[PDB]
Amino acid sequence: MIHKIRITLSSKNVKNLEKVCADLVRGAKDKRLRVKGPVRMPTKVLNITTRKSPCGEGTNTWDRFELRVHKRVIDLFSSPDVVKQITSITIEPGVEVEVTIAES
Amino acid sequence: WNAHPKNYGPGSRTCRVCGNPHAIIRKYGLMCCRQCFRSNAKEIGFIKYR
Amino acid sequence: MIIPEKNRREISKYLFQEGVCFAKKDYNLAKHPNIDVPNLQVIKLMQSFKSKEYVRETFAWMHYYWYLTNDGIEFLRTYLNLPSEIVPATLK
Amino acid sequence: QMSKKRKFVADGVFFAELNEVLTRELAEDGYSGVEVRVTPMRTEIIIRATRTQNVLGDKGRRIRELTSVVQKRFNFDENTVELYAEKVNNRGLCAIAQAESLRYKLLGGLAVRRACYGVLRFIMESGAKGCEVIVSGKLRAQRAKSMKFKDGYMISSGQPVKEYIDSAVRHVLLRQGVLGIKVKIMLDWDPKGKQGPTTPLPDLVTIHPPKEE
Amino acid sequence: GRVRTKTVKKSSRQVIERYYSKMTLDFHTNKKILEEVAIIPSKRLRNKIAGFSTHLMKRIQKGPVRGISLK
RNA sequence: GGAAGGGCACCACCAGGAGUGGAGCCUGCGGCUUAAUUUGACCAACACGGGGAAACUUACCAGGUCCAGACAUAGUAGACUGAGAGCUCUUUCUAUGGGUGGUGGUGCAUGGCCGUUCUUAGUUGGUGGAGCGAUUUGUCUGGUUAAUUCCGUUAACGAACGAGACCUCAGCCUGCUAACUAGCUAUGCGGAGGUUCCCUUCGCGGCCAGCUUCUUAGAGGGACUACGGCCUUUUAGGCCGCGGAAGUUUGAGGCAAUAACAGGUCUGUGAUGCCCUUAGAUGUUCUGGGCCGCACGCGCGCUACACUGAUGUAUUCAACGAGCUUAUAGCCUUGGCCGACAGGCCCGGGUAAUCUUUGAAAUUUCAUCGUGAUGGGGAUAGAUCAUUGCAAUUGUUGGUCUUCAACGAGGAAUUCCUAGUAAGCGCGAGUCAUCAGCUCGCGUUGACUACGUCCCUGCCCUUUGUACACACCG
RNA sequence: AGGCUGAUAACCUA
């Protein structure tokens, strides 16, 4: 009857990602469901280092470009229908919500 | 006409923005030349921190 | 540009059926992603339309973007010999 | 299925490419930006333009064409992506809109000195803490030179530049060459976060007035 | 060096001018007062203002100062 | 300015360390040679154009194709060959104007971007004062600061930029939030050892053992020179010290003013003016060669000249990061098997804190070698095997045996650097089918010397001289 | 021939 449902959230903005995580956890505490999380995976830092100059003249200066990806994992012990209702709420821009049934 | 294989090497790959075949950034599948990427780096989502 | 008559109809049919079309600037591509006609023939055929103002052309990131105009719709209907009440999908 | 690293990069590349396509297709329609709102079952694209009446076209003919071509170009499922036009609330605080506005004034034939001051004066009247317009290229003589029109406050260095400075760069293809337009507008602190950044300047310290009760 | 800039010095004098009664000789207490009676964007700036204001309070105890007007 | 006074910088010196310059080799540049050896650039060019070119790249050279010449007007099986590519056979367009393309020229026509002046602290309105005026004062005698940083003086008063603040990473939190993609402790069961209990050690299990110290990452706290002594003018501030994770703006970065350069880039761009060419093409494609060619000069480097070592064992500890279309399978690869190696075959995992990752070297340890160019050094060269690819010859690279050059610490000269720094040691990433002696990051081992000065090379500010202003390269 | 100088002379080294 009760199943462990895993919700994964990814985003480039920390505040938006944290805001959605609080809403889901707070939205599940209202239904008195068991909640495990949020679990914060290590931040993925995509890095691109490139020559600033469009040509090869001058001092060799480099720009270090970073694109940080923050990942959150939330586990809810409830039926898929209840989880669907909680996650149906509008999500902040840039936050990707992925709901899957944990294989255990 | 165009019979020579183009399965690998610089000739097969070109910048997706300008079409130039030099200084292609293949990391993460960007497929953009170093000049085009720097111009569009902010829009793509890359930022300079340090 | 000697486009086969069979291929020419497909481009006009697709262009008239949907008021927009696009093509990658890759003359070596064997087949257009949306039409069986070779990619090169699509680019060259709509270049003729651009010169005659039948379409409006935009280029960006190695891709063409063509939009049918009022004159283009009139020309295609006569060329395709279709009822005057049929219009491109963009006009509905 | 693709890894997270490539998916985010792919999303970024889509936004960059989409903006460039609209920047040229809607060049003479006041295009000022775009917002991509990907949602389940539907991806929403919001186009910001000073003159929305021209972007939509007659009975929304043009907007449908943009939706159709975008859907085919980017391998979207039919009837799964929508384009919505929107109007800029404060046209005078958008550097991109002002840069394009100055671009067409020069193309028409208006003098550089007069056109630049018109944009500079308009931006300040709109409630901007400051502005700066730079035009470079072959103005009248064969040799190129730069004219700088500045007024009000302005900052160059530090993190606050990202939040308080709105900058745009555009090219004017004239008969004798290319002119370079650079519009730099410094926004004002807006606690509501609409006209300008909500966060104050780091060096701005405010002392609450004491109360007598 | 550790010379306070105009931002730190100017803000510190203003706080003491209109909150001399609240201010004390303890840095830890003073920095909590600044949060209540002022909006300082950064923590580091707040600490510098609190420390310099505490220095000014010690100055006032021994005698009058130049840039502070206590009615 | 080979004038004076003050201040400052390891792209300056001092005290030092590592060196470079000498040798071999790698790579870049010049020259020579060449059908071509494409070309830009000469502190601020020369492992730079992310330029590690077998084809492509490709711009060069020797040849063959193709039109991928819109739009508008007027007119009417054989021979050859590198290859039957094209041209015949067989089977079933041409002018004119106007375009298009061009890594063609011009960066001294331009946009944008970047470098540099310039890492220093500098720059500029308003009103008022002074001067016929250029211009000046404000922007300063003095003290102080990394700082035009501040305290003060005061014909100036009040502001705008830069500096600072700020943003990112690192250093403290036994406190908060909480984790089966991270762990610990305890417990249960099992294996082994020692004396059935017990002790030591290892494995496995428990979403109802518990918990968050270790790991991860959100929110906050924490330093302010706070406190003590002394020196400074009542100042600004400085020196030393307790405590403290931290007392150099705590460390390192990012961002970064005015005014400039005929600095670089037209070979990043469907950025671009004009010029040139456009079908016996400077367009495009195909084949082959070249970009690497070697009497010589130069720059960045790699490996060394050994015993503080090489070799053979035993032993053992990181961090940053990266990874697939699943087609039998194109990415990172565990495990099993075959092989001396290289490599091959099979079953699989991982679109990832889940799998690769149980994840390095220097070093540590024992033995051998023994001052001999020696078991130092590994250039040059022969034979042969395998791998990537459509293609390996002018060796792509990787293995096996053999061959075993200079080099014994480097002339004049010259570079970098003040602490987890120098240096040593390896790893990941970029380029990438294959190829790293390069670049961008990462950790591991871990110092000497200084805590200054303006002597050299430069920079900032005042006074002063000037016949300079293209500004002493006058 | 190399070094020194932005470059030449002068100077220094081989």
Ligand SMILES: *[C@@H]1O[C@H](CO)[C@@H](O)[C@H](O)[C@H]1O
């Ligand atoms: C143009 O206006 C938009 C309005 O949303 C603003 O977001 C941009 O920053 C500005 O350039």
Ligand SMILES: [K+]
């Ligand atoms: K040497």
Ligand SMILES: [K+]
């Ligand atoms: K270089």
Ligand SMILES: [K+]
């Ligand atoms: K330029």
Ligand SMILES: [K+]
């Ligand atoms: K004045």
Ligand SMILES: [K+]
């Ligand atoms: K046991």
Ligand SMILES: [K+]
């Ligand atoms: K350019």
Ligand SMILES: [K+]
């Ligand atoms: K040109």
Ligand SMILES: [K+]
């Ligand atoms: K390029």
Ligand SMILES: [K+]
């Ligand atoms: K050898």
Ligand SMILES: [Mg+2]
């Ligand atoms: Mg500032």
Ligand SMILES: [Mg+2]
């Ligand atoms: Mg700063």
Ligand SMILES: [Mg+2]
């Ligand atoms: Mg020093």
Ligand SMILES: [Mg+2]
């Ligand atoms: Mg030097």
Ligand SMILES: [Mg+2]
């Ligand atoms: Mg010395």
Ligand SMILES: [Mg+2]
């Ligand atoms: Mg050496």
